């Protein structure tokens, strides 16, 4: 044939993720749209370098609800700064339901497909997102020819061949009907990594400050006293231990959320803080004068 009908693994930068997410969530509940600017290379790579949002609508995303006068005006700026790049797909946020596509969004999808042969749709649902990465997938049109003549899974070949689900129920429904989903990847250069992270100027101040001592008499006093109540129960657990079954041990003497595990945990965690506190205090006095 004349095609290879394969979907790209989508590389989304640092620069693009935050813009997509910030606009989706401030704007939610209300479906919102905007284009994605990038670079196309290969047939298995598509870059989402930058993005810009396009104005709100309460009629959801349609081809009759977009502002083309706005798109034009932006591309005119884009040329005067010398940053012009080609449109590589489009992004939208659904307002409250998982990544899937409705009919209205297939109509919007179809025309980006015509404009640029390969293009992606990245769909951000920012209120089922909690790791900044979950419930964000890319999608791409499946042709009607692809279903009936089995030219749909040529995108499972010459790639990793894995698809990682965020919503099992929601993806699987549109996976045969009207889209094929392929997994998303993230990227940055090393200049970006350092910027994204930052180094704090208060990182050095909080190192060299020993906290108030009123809060420290309280800390030691409270902690050492609390470990007496559970120290006693640690004996009663192990009165017998030669009895079979781990759940059994916990049911006889009420060792549920074990007194060995809790008491130890308390011993390690107050211990970590006290060593660091005597360290900070001794550092400041010897250092400064």
């Amino acid at each position: 044939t004349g095609r290879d009908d394969t979907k790209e693994t989508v590389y989304i930068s640092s620069i693009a993720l935050l813009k997509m997410l910030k606009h989706g969530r401030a704007g939610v509940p209300m479906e919102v749209m905007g284009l994605m600017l990038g670079e196309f290379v290969d047939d298995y790579t598509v870059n989402v370098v930058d993005v810009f949002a396009m104005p709100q609508s309460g009629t959801g995303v349609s081809v009759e609800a977009v502002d083309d006068v706005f798109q034009a005006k932006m591309m005119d700026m884009l040329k005067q700064t010398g940053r012009d790049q080609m449109v590589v797909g489009w992004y939208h946020s659904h307002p409250g339901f998982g990544c899937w596509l409705s009919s209205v969004d297939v109509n919007t999808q179809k025309s980006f497909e015509q404009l640029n042969s390969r293009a992606v749709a990245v769909v951000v649902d920012p209120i089922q997102s909690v790791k900044g990465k979950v419930v964000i997938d890319a999608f791409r049109l499946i042709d009607t020819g692809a279903l009936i003549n089995n030219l749909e899974p040529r995108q499972t070949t010459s790639n990793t061949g894995l698809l990682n689900k965020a919503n099992i129920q929601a993806l699987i429904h549109g996976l045969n009907r009207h889209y094929y989903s392929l997994n998303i990847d993230y990227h940055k250069t090393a200049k970006e990594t350092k910027m994204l992270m930052n180094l704090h100027k208060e990182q050095w101040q909080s190192g060299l400050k020993m906290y108030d001592y009123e809060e420290k008499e309280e800390s030691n006093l409270a902690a050492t006293k609390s470990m007496v109540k559970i120290a006693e129960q640690y004996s009663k657990r192990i009165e017998e231990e030669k009895e079979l079954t781990e759940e059994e041990l916990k049911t006889r003497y009420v060792g549920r959320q074990d007194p060995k595990k809790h008491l130890s945990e308390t011993a390690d965690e107050t211990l970590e803080n006290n060593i660091v506190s005597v360290l900070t205090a001794g550092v400041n006095s010897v250092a400064i004068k």
Binding site: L17, G132, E202
Partner: peptide
């Protein structure tokens, strides 16, 4: 300056990062 971001942006920062972090 100390630098801040909304909780919208922040989740994507925390997990994209793939280091120890000074934050």
């Amino acid at each position: 300056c100390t630098i801040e971001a909304e909780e919208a942006e922040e989740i994507g920062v925390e997990h994209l990062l793939r280091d120890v972090r000074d934050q």
